[PDB]
Amino acid sequence: HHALPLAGIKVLDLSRVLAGPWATMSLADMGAEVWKIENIQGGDDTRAWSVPNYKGASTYFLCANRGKKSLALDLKSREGLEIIHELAKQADVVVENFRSGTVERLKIDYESLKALNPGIVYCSISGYGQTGPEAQRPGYDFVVQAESGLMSITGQIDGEPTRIGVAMTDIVAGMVATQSVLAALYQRKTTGLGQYIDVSLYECALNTLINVGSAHLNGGHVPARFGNAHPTVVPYQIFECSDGAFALAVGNDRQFAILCERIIDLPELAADERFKTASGRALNRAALIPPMAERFRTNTRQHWMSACLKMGVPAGQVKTVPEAFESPNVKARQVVQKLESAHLGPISLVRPAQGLKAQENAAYKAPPMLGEDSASVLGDVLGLDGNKLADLIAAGVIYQYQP
Amino acid sequence: HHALPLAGIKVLDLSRVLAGPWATMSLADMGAEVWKIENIQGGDDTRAWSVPNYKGASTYFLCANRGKKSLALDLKSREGLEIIHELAKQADVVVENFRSGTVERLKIDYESLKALNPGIVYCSISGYGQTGPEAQRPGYDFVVQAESGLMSITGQIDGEPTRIGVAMTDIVAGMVATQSVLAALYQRKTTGLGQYIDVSLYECALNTLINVGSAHLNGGHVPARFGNAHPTVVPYQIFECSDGAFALAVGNDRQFAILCERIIDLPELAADERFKTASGRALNRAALIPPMAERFRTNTRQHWMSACLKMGVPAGQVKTVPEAFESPNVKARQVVQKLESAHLGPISLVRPAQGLKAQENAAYKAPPMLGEDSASVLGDVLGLDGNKLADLIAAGVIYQYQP
User: Fold this and answer.
1) Using an 8 Å Cβ cutoff, are A125 and A95 in contact?
2) Bridging pattern class, strands A33-39 and A121-126
3) Contact predicate B59/A211, CB 8 Å
4) First and final CA of chain A: distance in angstroms?
């Protein structure tokens, strides 16, 4: 109905776990055809992560594999490699995040596929990059959160370093890789040529240090833990109320004055030279927060949030994940999306966030069962007849999901 | 030397704070020319956030404004709007994250600029989107972390919900917006037309719930707090050693067996049916972790990490941000980047993570001073002569940084 930007782009998706699979899911969400190549023995690693499960299937797998066609294949087999190379001749993009040396060992490395298809955009996501001393080193989100410095600044001030409840660095690396693939496809419209992309999970994590890292790199400022407070914006933190906590976020000097004179009734704070400007509130933070905290404990959370809403002071409340999906805009903008799996029935996912108009009424293929699309991809893309498909199954080269 | 993918792309950057500025910095990192339009009174909001500062300048501003030309301008002035519209006729992209209704009030909204330039790709980043009940509502990273459910799952199990030490959701929204702009530019090479993009910070945050959200949406599983543990992968968490903590990450059943039989010397665990598979280790987590934790306290952190490295079990250590920038690959791959500011001297930043080869030897403009490039942009892009530039300065329409 509404054509998506990447229609006609074909992706040979060798990725697994989360970082790569999120990149190719995103390319699919923007209109690409994705051929998820999976090992016959269990396929993507996330398929084995069956705690929790929906109707016996990994829920982890569901979150990053919308819109993909699953071809279960024996990559080490002689016949399986031939299939990969025939598909690479048709492919616009290749994405892989195997351990170091795997693609070379399997002859699906960039140089091998480049000879088959010089226009191919080849994207490799690795823990620490393809060069340097730690190139051989495995990359996991939890390790990168520890070593990137994200954990050292996250958590309670006196508490221990804390990880994020999700694998945020893998998501970031997948989003960065999506940018790289898109920009290389854009350049290919002129040069006609592909190229190799080396995305590093660790460098993606370092990029997320933003203001904390730039202060360290410029002036040598040593990072500190601020808990639920911010290191530069004040008052920008959680405050305790009589019945519970609420998040207060003032961005500009005008909002702070409104808070003091119209909501918490401490007009002297807005008059004080220490607290008038945002730079002054950070310096004199120690003197500003305590009187505010005392004032907030006098009323309930709903009282303060209603006052903030009337007066225009940005405030929010800590919501559980189930509460978040009940928010008014989730219902209004139809954020939660219903897809139909032939075998699992309806599957609900958060819709793509790119904000392209052609995505609103787009119909998305549900996350595939292992090998759900083996015969469809081989028939449509390579023209394999029925007889050849039966030979491949008998030899164990391919697997097709059977109800 | 090495041409970048977006060379020749021109961006009219009206964004401020972090989400938008990160999107246009990324477009600049991939080769675009960016015209950062800033209010004469202080410019970007981050410029006022001078705690911490380097040589008196905001370090926060430095992290998201590499590669941009700063034009200090009075957007409400009659002459300033004319400049914006003349630049929009030359622009390939527009990016804005003003409060709701600002662009309409200033006549820089999408419909106004679309008539000037039908090919313009217009990207608007908002807190909750451009439609629905909360469209008028302000969007701040701290509020979205609270309300998206990220805080409810992050932090110690018995502790209070905790935010991330950086504004991760704004970074994610900027990265998503970069994808949207790129995909729309790719489609424009065929259709010849621009389009409007509506990126929602809140929906970008919901996308990051990945496996936690998909389990909730499929099977109604209620999320729980796991602290430094993972909800689905075991043993994947922090363990205490005699002298301190270390992060252990086993992804596959083979690594778990090696850990038990070759490192911690608890071979019975690998033999137990409960702990043999990853799905079984999550179910029987309560019985597996305690014996492992007891075993780790018998030796030092360095002993266990050395053993993990020899045997191939992925492990890591919690590093401070300064420690992270001393890691071997940061030095080898030249991750930290030195730029020259005319007025601040050398400025160090983390290099772009897209992994394009043309970025390795690219030279990047240092983050600009307010109005550092006002005369250069007006002269080069609009052909304004010296006499006209002097009139604009005298009337207060533009500001040029003076040493």
Assistant:
1) yes
2) unpaired
3) yes
4) 31
A121-126/A93-96 β-pairing: parallel
Which helix (H) or strand (E) covers residue A236, if one does? strand A236-240
What CA–CA distance (Å, rounded) separates B297 from B242? 5
The residue among B165, B174, B163 whose CA lies nearest residue B204 is B174
CB-closest option in B172, B278, B356 to A48: B278
CA distance A262 to A264: 6
Residue B217 within a domain: no
What is the C-alpha to C-alpha distance for residues B81 and B321, in angstroms, rounded to an integer?
A: 43
Q: Report the greatest alpha carbon distance in chain A.
A: 85
Q: Are residues B306 and B374 part of one domain? A: no
CA distance B391 to chain A (A): 32
Is any Cβ of chain B less than 8 angstroms from the Cβ of A382?
A: no
What is the spatial distance between Cα A186 and Cα B182, in angstroms, rounded to a whole number?
Answer: 8
Structure tokens at B368: 């600009």
Contact yes or no for A246/A301 (Cβ under 8 A): yes
Could you give the count of Cα atoms lying within 13 Å of A351 in the half-sphere of its Cβ? 24
A24: tokens are 């190719």
CB B235 within 8 A of CB B248: yes
Interface contact flag, A354 B183, Cβ < 8 Å: yes
User: How many angstroms separate the CA atoms of A230 and B70, rounded?
Assistant: 27
What is the amino acid identity at position A298? T
CA nearest A176: which of A269, A95, A267, A232? A95
User: Quick one: tokens of B379?
Assistant: 């002269």
In sign, the C-alpha dihedral spanning B250, B253, B255, B259 is positive
Q: What is the CATH number of the domain that holds B303?
A: 3.30.1540.10
Check the CA dihedral A189-A190-A195-A199 and report its sign.
Answer: negative
Q: Taking CB atoms and an 8 Å limit, are A60 and B232 in contact across chains?
A: yes
Residues A342 and A309 placed together within one structural domain of the fold: no
CA distance A386 to chain B (A): 36
Write out the E strands in A57-120: 57-58, 68-73, 93-96
| 8 Å CB contact of B153 and A175 | no
Cis peptide before A235 (omega within 30 of 0): yes
Q: Which of B65, B31, B93 is nearest to B356 (CA)?
A: B31
Experimental method: X-ray
Spatial separation of the C-alpha atoms in residues A255 and B316, rounded to whole Å? 43
CB neighbours of B310 closer than 8 A, spacing ≥ 6?
A: none
Residues 93-112 of A with CB under 8 A from B: none
* Closest residue in B to A282 (Cα–Cα): B51
Question: In the block, which residue shows the tokens 């898109």?
Answer: A182
Answer for the pair B225, A165: CB distance below 8 angstroms, yes or no.
yes
Apex B141 CA angle, B135 and B144, nearest 5: 60
Please judge whether A168 and B168 are an interchain contact, meaning their C-beta atoms are less than 8 angstroms apart. Answer: yes
Give how many domains chain B has, as a whole number: 2
Q: Do A230 and B142 touch (CB under 8 A)?
A: yes
Do B174 and B306 have their domain in common? Answer: no
Residue B336's CB is within 10 A of a number of other CB atoms, namely 15
Q: Is B222 inside any structural domain?
A: no
- Residue A392 φ then ψ, to 5°: -65, -35
Report residue B179 as tokens: 């994808």
Domain boundary pick from A290, A321, A352? A321
- The resolution in angstroms reads 2.9
CB B123 within 8 A of CB B94: yes
d(CA B52, CA A149): 18
Contact A225, B356 (CB under 8 A): no
Report if residue A198 sits inside a domain: yes
Q: Which two tokens stand for residue B86?
A: 């003349």
Residue B163 sits at φ, ψ, to 5 deg, of -85, 165
User: CB contact, 8 Å: B347 with chain A?
Assistant: yes
Q: Position of tokens 């699309």?
A: A373
Q: Are residues B135 and B190 in the same domain?
A: yes
